[PDB]
Amino acid sequence: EVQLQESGPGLVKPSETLSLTCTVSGGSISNYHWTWIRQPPGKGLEWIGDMYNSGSTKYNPSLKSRVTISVDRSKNQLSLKLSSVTVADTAVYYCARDDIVIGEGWYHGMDLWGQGTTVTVSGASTKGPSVFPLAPSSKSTSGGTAALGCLVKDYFPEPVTVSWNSGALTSGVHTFPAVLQSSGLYSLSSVVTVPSSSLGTQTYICNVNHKPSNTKVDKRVEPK
Amino acid sequence: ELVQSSSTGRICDSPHRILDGENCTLIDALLGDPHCDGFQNKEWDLFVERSKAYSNCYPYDVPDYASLRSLVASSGTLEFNNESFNWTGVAQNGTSYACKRSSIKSFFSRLNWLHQLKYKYPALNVTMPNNDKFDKLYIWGVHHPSTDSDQTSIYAQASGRVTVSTKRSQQTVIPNIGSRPWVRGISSRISIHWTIVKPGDILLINSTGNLIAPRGYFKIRSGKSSIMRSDAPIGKCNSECITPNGSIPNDKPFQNVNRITYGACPRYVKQN
Amino acid sequence: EIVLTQSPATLSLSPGERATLSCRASQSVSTDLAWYQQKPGQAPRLLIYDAISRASGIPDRFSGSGSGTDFTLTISSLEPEDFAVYYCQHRSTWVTFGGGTKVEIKRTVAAPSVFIFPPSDEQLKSGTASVVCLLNNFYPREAKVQWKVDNALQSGNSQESVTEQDSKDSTYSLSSTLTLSKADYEKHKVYACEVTHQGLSSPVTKSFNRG
Ligand SMILES: *[C@@H]1O[C@H](CO)[C@@H](O[C@@H]2O[C@H](CO)[C@@H](O[C@@H]3O[C@H](CO)[C@@H](O)[C@H](O)[C@@H]3O)[C@H](O)[C@H]2NC(C)=O)[C@H](O)[C@H]1NC(C)=O
Ligand SMILES: *[C@@H]1O[C@H](CO)[C@@H](O[C@@H]2O[C@H](CO)[C@@H](O[C@@H]3O[C@H](CO)[C@@H](O)[C@H](O)[C@@H]3O)[C@H](O)[C@H]2NC(C)=O)[C@H](O)[C@H]1NC(C)=O
Ligand SMILES: *[C@@H]1O[C@H](CO)[C@@H](O[C@@H]2O[C@H](CO)[C@@H](O[C@@H]3O[C@H](CO)[C@@H](O)[C@H](O)[C@@H]3O)[C@H](O)[C@H]2NC(C)=O)[C@H](O)[C@H]1NC(C)=O
């Protein structure tokens, strides 16, 4: 099955050039038409450009002078290059394939669409997160159900990935969306509801991964 | 005496069954051009083509136009019987902008434009027998893409073939990827081909790419029917003889009007 | 350039009901429009192509329609796993997308289970105290969380975030964080968050007492 994976940075300071590489597994890259799409935060979807089977490229007129889509046979990778990066370019960028038939008028398809490298454009410094336990209590024991979690505080930029017990605990986990406090850093909390009987016996690890800062943190949430 | 001359200027709708393909040619009605959908499964004793007729669908080029035109002419019927071929692994019902039916994209009603499905186009091999006693006429086509990117985007094959074989004839067409002149916003073309499956014979489709599959067979009917290109009005009257210049009395022994006569008609004589 | 405008901006329909989403275009487009479903934090998924034709996997409940200027998509029997923002896209000469319509499946009223978490001794050593109040699996989404520090109301010093609608139980979860300095935290004793919600006939007040 043809599968795609976006590889790219997490932060690009303004005036630089964004470089995003889309690696495709299980298919032929010279065949099939591809296209890049970005999603600005809370703004919607926008078309960046597309490279076709003929190798000819077509870019959004608003972003022609800065966009360049290249491919590297012997690597099976799709390269997006966005020069003169401004903060409006802060979005989640995606590489997708199209079922286009130029000439016959057959424009129908998006199929494989990617994962989405979040790119933040700012002059800030990538700062790792600080994980603090949200410990339960005998008060949290309301006769059966209790709650515990982790507070992932003060990091930049988005995102962070929080798992519980190396992914072995998923039932009831609620990784909350991040908030941007007044300091300019992000902060979120990931909680999970467990039976209060299993508090003093089951160990609870929260695994926080902040790729833009190359930070992995493992923390034990335990009662006092 | 002798020559008749004395043309009327109108073709009588009696006693012979006359069909006025206004704006529509026989080959166009055979394929299913949207402006000819009112001629489906209709019979005739004499079919009259007009000079005002045109084609308003995908651009087609019939290699042997005269024979296929003469085949359907003699049968005097456009009766189409649908068959269910097992086109497994491909997608059917391909439409384009040129063939616009009811203001929507469409195609020839009697043809099936097989294209890619899940980016995979396998080597199709289907067979249908002529268990019935009437000879079957299968009308198929071959698509000629504009560029190699089109050939890859529709069929996912660098090149294709279409081979239609029987006990007596094997027809192989190789696509010619080219940029023909623009007609109805399209630079590609399609080549129509026919194959008659006699009783006790089988039809073999070996297509590896660019197949315009048929949706069924037609009925070769033994009949005295034929066709005649004429621009004369079809009036209401009774006349046994018919010429492109109008109905003619069959009382006199010979005709100098034209070498094109249908039915009981005085034989032709030259004007000078 | 062609511009697509979807209506309405947000649809709220109970399970089993029928969804109708429009995508009026500026100029004539013909059957050259496609509908996409973007689950939260996920990929847009091609639903309908060529205005009407359905793609692989796309069930029969999805049914698009239209031809020129006005195009519509009809989701029959809305299931809880249909909560997403739906987009329409045109593709000829250029590529243009729509504004998006958020469909929100509506379950029965569910009261939130409230939990409170005192600050960690680690964070207290740093100099900041973050108190967290958790409201787990509730609907409707509308809720008021009021913080109280020694019978004193709390505004400005507390933020909150709500999870997007769960694609199965159609419930929401809310997390409110009250931030104070270490000096201000140890100067008081009682810390509570007062939750007022429709399913709560009386406001709930979860609290702790040290600090
Ligand atoms: C054979 O073909 C001729 C030529 O196409 C037909 O005459 C034309 O028929 C059309 C039918 O749509 C007439 O329509 C025009 O429609 C547009 C709508 O956008 C409008 O702009 C025009 O005012 C008009 O209403 C057209 O006037 C007419 N005459 C022409 C083209 O000179 C004829 O009807 C066809 N006959 C058969 C039997 O198919
Ligand atoms: C390409 O289109 C043809 C024509 O629709 C498909 O073949 C089958 O044709 C029959 C008769 O035209 C269709 O039955 C019809 O169903 C409608 C809807 O209930 C009904 O209103 C009509 O009276 C008629 O009974 C049949 O649905 C259709 N088959 C399918 C699967 O649509 C052919 O299958 C199409 N090729 C594809 C989809 O690859
Ligand atoms: C035309 O359609 C026919 C109908 O199926 C196809 O016939 C048969 O196709 C197979 C390939 O699947 C041919 O290859 C044979 O394969 C076996 C191994 O599986 C090999 O041992 C044989 O020596 C042979 O190579 C087969 O010859 C052919 N005919 C028969 C009677 O089975 C055909 O492939 C289609 N295409 C063409 C160009 O004929």
Short mmCIF file of C-alpha atoms in Angstrom, two decimals, chain A residues 35 37 39 43-47 50 58-61 64 94 97-98 100 105-111 113-115 131-137 139-140 142 145-149 151 153 172 174-182 187 189 191-193 219 224, chain C residues 1 31-32 34 36 38 41-44 46 49-50 85 87 89 91-99 113-124 126 128 130 132 134-137 159-164 166 169 171 173-175 177 179 205-207:
data_model
loop_
_atom_site.label_atom_id
_atom_site.label_comp_id
_atom_site.label_asym_id
_atom_site.label_seq_id
_atom_site.Cartn_x
_atom_site.Cartn_y
_atom_site.Cartn_z
CA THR A 35 0.42 18.04 -4.31
CA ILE A 37 -1.47 21.43 1.09
CA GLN A 39 -3.62 24.19 7.03
CA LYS A 43 -8.13 29.14 9.07
CA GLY A 44 -8.85 26.12 6.85
CA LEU A 45 -7.14 24.32 4.01
CA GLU A 46 -5.02 26.05 1.36
CA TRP A 47 -3.37 24.77 -1.82
CA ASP A 50 1.42 20.24 -7.23
CA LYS A 58 2.15 24.35 -10.84
CA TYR A 59 2.06 26.62 -7.80
CA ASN A 60 -0.57 28.83 -6.19
CA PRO A 61 -0.18 32.31 -7.77
CA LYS A 64 4.80 31.35 -6.63
CA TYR A 94 0.74 18.02 4.21
CA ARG A 97 -1.41 12.48 -4.09
CA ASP A 98 -3.97 13.38 -6.75
CA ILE A 100 -5.60 13.94 -11.99
CA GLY A 105 -10.53 16.75 -17.80
CA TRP A 106 -10.59 13.98 -15.17
CA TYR A 107 -10.03 15.90 -11.92
CA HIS A 108 -11.22 13.53 -9.19
CA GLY A 109 -9.20 12.40 -6.18
CA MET A 110 -6.99 13.07 -3.16
CA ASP A 111 -6.49 9.50 -1.81
CA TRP A 113 -2.87 12.52 2.03
CA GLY A 114 -0.06 12.22 4.60
CA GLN A 115 0.34 12.88 8.31
CA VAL A 131 6.27 17.45 33.45
CA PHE A 132 4.60 17.64 36.86
CA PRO A 133 2.36 14.94 38.37
CA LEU A 134 -1.37 15.45 38.85
CA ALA A 135 -1.55 13.01 41.73
CA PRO A 136 -4.88 11.55 42.91
CA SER A 137 -6.01 11.40 46.54
CA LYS A 139 -10.75 12.60 47.95
CA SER A 140 -10.47 11.49 44.31
CA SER A 142 -15.45 8.78 45.34
CA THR A 145 -13.51 5.95 40.11
CA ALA A 146 -10.47 8.20 40.57
CA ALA A 147 -8.48 10.44 38.24
CA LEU A 148 -4.79 11.22 37.77
CA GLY A 149 -2.65 12.81 35.10
CA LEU A 151 0.83 18.56 33.60
CA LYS A 153 3.90 22.94 31.13
CA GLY A 172 -10.25 6.88 29.36
CA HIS A 174 -7.87 12.53 27.70
CA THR A 175 -4.84 14.46 26.43
CA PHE A 176 -6.20 18.00 26.54
CA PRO A 177 -5.48 20.55 23.79
CA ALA A 178 -2.61 22.90 24.56
CA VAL A 179 -3.17 26.47 25.73
CA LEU A 180 -0.80 29.34 24.97
CA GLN A 181 -0.24 31.20 28.22
CA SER A 182 0.80 34.85 28.35
CA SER A 187 0.92 24.07 28.45
CA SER A 189 -2.55 18.32 30.82
CA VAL A 191 -5.52 12.84 32.52
CA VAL A 192 -6.89 9.31 32.82
CA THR A 193 -9.68 7.82 34.93
CA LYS A 219 7.18 10.48 35.05
CA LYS A 224 0.94 11.03 48.34
CA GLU C 1 -10.63 33.19 -9.00
CA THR C 31 -19.51 18.50 -11.77
CA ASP C 32 -15.99 19.45 -10.61
CA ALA C 34 -15.29 17.12 -4.06
CA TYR C 36 -13.73 15.91 2.36
CA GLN C 38 -11.34 16.05 8.45
CA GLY C 41 -6.14 15.97 14.50
CA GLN C 42 -6.44 13.81 11.38
CA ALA C 43 -6.47 13.65 7.62
CA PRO C 44 -9.15 14.99 5.33
CA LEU C 46 -12.10 12.06 0.19
CA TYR C 49 -15.76 13.19 -6.21
CA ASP C 50 -17.31 14.62 -9.38
CA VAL C 85 -15.30 19.58 9.80
CA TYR C 87 -14.79 20.75 3.26
CA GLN C 89 -12.92 21.60 -3.06
CA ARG C 91 -10.11 21.61 -9.09
CA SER C 92 -9.67 23.16 -12.54
CA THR C 93 -7.12 25.74 -13.74
CA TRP C 94 -6.49 26.25 -10.00
CA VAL C 95 -7.37 24.64 -6.65
CA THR C 96 -9.79 26.26 -4.20
CA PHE C 97 -11.20 24.93 -0.92
CA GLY C 98 -14.22 25.80 1.19
CA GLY C 99 -14.72 27.44 4.55
CA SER C 113 -17.44 14.01 36.97
CA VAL C 114 -15.30 16.67 38.65
CA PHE C 115 -11.77 16.16 39.98
CA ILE C 116 -9.23 18.63 41.37
CA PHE C 117 -5.44 18.27 41.51
CA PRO C 118 -3.31 20.25 44.01
CA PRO C 119 0.06 21.64 42.90
CA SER C 120 3.07 19.37 42.82
CA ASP C 121 5.82 19.83 45.40
CA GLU C 122 8.19 19.95 42.43
CA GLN C 123 6.42 22.97 40.93
CA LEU C 124 6.17 24.57 44.38
CA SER C 126 10.23 26.26 41.39
CA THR C 128 4.74 28.61 40.71
CA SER C 130 -0.76 25.37 39.17
CA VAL C 132 -6.03 21.86 37.88
CA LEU C 134 -10.98 18.36 35.57
CA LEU C 135 -14.48 17.91 34.11
CA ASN C 136 -14.61 14.51 32.42
CA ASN C 137 -17.13 13.26 29.82
CA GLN C 159 -7.31 29.37 31.83
CA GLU C 160 -9.08 26.35 30.37
CA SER C 161 -9.23 24.12 27.30
CA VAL C 162 -11.93 21.75 26.04
CA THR C 163 -11.32 18.56 24.10
CA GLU C 164 -13.11 18.30 20.78
CA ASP C 166 -15.30 12.43 21.26
CA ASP C 169 -19.71 8.89 23.20
CA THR C 171 -18.94 13.90 25.25
CA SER C 173 -13.81 17.11 28.62
CA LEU C 174 -12.68 20.40 30.17
CA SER C 175 -9.43 21.24 31.98
CA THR C 177 -5.69 25.55 35.31
CA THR C 179 -1.85 29.60 38.22
CA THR C 205 -17.51 22.28 44.59
CA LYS C 206 -14.41 20.08 44.75
CA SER C 207 -11.73 21.40 47.08
#
